[PDB]
Amino acid sequence: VTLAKVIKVLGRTGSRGGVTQVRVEFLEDTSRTIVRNVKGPVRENDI
Amino acid sequence: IVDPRVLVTTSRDPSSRLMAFSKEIRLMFPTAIRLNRGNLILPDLVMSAQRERLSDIILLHEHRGTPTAITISHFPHGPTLMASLHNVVLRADIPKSIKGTVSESYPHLIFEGFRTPLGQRVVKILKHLFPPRDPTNNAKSGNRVITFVNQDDCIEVRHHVYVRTNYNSVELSEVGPRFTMRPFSITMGTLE
């Protein structure tokens, strides 16, 4: 579900940005939401 | 009609060994369903037949009186028959290399010892049970045959894969399962 883009919010006005997700080597579907690290599309996700 | 679907139902006295026989005889190739619970008390068989849309059913039961008993049942009038079988612990297992095996192909049938007998029921049963899809077109590429032979009072169920050469030539290789059925109680349909 490789986290899509990271469209945060201004500067210091965002506890954390959101992030869509699906999958490549498994699933595939729309999404966003729960996670607040700071990786990137370089990083990825799972389904 | 559509292909008849089969429902395998483990009875209250079904065990591991009998369940192994169920699994090998039945398989999702693909007109079959398995349940780990079932009973032959009743109207219950008619209930399961309607709710699961299965016109073929096999109950698995074992007591010392009737060990490894497989009660074949058809929704159509003229049904039930108990077929009990037993295996020897010394039988070697054929685990599959000979049979790369395409699941869902129309099996061939050979019956040795056809008559006349009130039996005829058994031939009718197994032909209705495993002949799957009824087509007008047949591709000649194999694969397997279901053989049933009468052995001076027991029916010998065997399954072979076909091999063909230019020597003729058909040769057979057994893939199992190998079953000797002992005939038990029978129920037959009314004329209506």
Partner: protein
Amino acid sequence: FGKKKSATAVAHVKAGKGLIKVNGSPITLVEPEILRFKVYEPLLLVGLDKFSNIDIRVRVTGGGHVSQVYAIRQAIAKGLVAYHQKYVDEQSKNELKKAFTSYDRTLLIADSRRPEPKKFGGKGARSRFQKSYR
């Protein structure tokens, strides 16, 4: 009036006083307790509109324990709302009802579950015996 997964509880309805006896006892007791509430929680559950009322009570009996408990359950509020007008509420008996079932599952009708079915197999049902021919 309400049976539960092989069990069955009967409903008594005609206005009276306190002490609503289940079986022939008192929804004080009802001793297959632990979760002895969820019984006193239909009456308690009356927490939504009423406080206890002033009516009746009947006996249950079928299958086994927690079965029965869950039965007497509907049994009650499936009999507060009793038609009415002599039992439920002489008007708009959705008073309780929709309230006594905006967090219910007992008076909230019964569950489509019920024991049966096995298999020519092992235990039966679906759990077909464990075999491993060699």
